[PDB]
Amino acid sequence: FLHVTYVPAQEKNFTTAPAICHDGKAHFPREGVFVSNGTHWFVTQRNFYEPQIITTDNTFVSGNCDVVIGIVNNTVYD
């Protein structure tokens, strides 16, 4: 059996947060995770790095800001 498999490579480290605090609401990524390149926050898929602007389409609110541990302040675009 010749198994063709996908192997990740060229890893890069980022600062990550569980949720984004916008106007009193927590925001969680619908798919992917929240990363930071030092000054700006993006949402990317887990296995590949394609940063995108955190918007309402790729985030769901589902809660408040105080309960979540590690939440950070950032704007969610509409």
Instruction: By CB under 6 A, tell whether 15 contacts ligand NAG.
Output: yes
Q: Are 56 and 41 in contact (CB under 8 A)?
A: no
Which residues contribute to the site for other proteins (CB under 8 A)? 7-9, 11, 13, 16, 18-19, 26, 28, 33, 46, 62-63, 67-70
52 binds, among other proteins, ligand NAG, none (CB under 5 to 8 A by kind): none
Spatial separation of the C-alpha atoms in residues 73 and 77, rounded to whole Å: 13
Report how many helices (DSSP H) and strands (DSSP E) the chain contains, helices first.
0, 8
16 binds, among ligand NAG, other proteins, none (CB under 5 to 8 A by kind): other proteins
